[PDB]
Amino acid sequence: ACDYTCGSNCYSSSDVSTAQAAGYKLHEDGETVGSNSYPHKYNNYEGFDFSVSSPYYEWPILSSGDVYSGGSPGADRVVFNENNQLAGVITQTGASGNNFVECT
Ligand SMILES: [Ca+2]
């Protein structure tokens, strides 16, 4: 079973914790990786109901289980906040342009 399903990508709770730990470390180090500079601020224009408060940051999560190191980020992402609390798992998959949709 999937703890989080983004389009056709299945994710376990272990996948999301491994991702978030990598992103959070980069945020503490004031560093980024990839052409689009991740992690970077996430604005919740879509009004997703997060039970953790902002500021929020996004980091790519990959379908392969590897942690993101540069190269193609895919469409999925973890969103965490300033206290290193998980907000939710989101995707561009099924969404136009600059929208996101939640992972289910
Ligand atoms: Ca996995």
UniProtKB/Swiss-Prot annotation:
- What EC class is this? lyase
Q: Where are the transmembrane segments?
A: none
Active site residues per record: H40, E58, Q92
Reactions catalysed, as given in the entry: [RNA] containing guanosine + H2O = an [RNA fragment]-3'-guanosine-3'-phosphate + a 5'-hydroxy-ribonucleotide-3'-[RNA fragment]
Query: Does the entry annotate any disulfide bonds, and if so which pairs?
Result: C2-C10, C6-C103
Give one GO term, molecular function aspect.
lyase activity
Q: Name one GO cellular component term.
A: hyphal tip
**Enzyme Commission code(s) on record:** 4.6.1.24
* Record carries keyword Signal: yes
This protein's source sits in the domain of life called Eukaryota
Keywords noted in UniProt: Disulfide bond, Endonuclease, Hydrolase, Lyase, Nuclease, Signal
The similarity comment for this entry is: Belongs to the ribonuclease N1/T1 family.
Subunit comment: Monomer.
**Protein name from the UniProt record:** Guanyl-specific ribonuclease T1
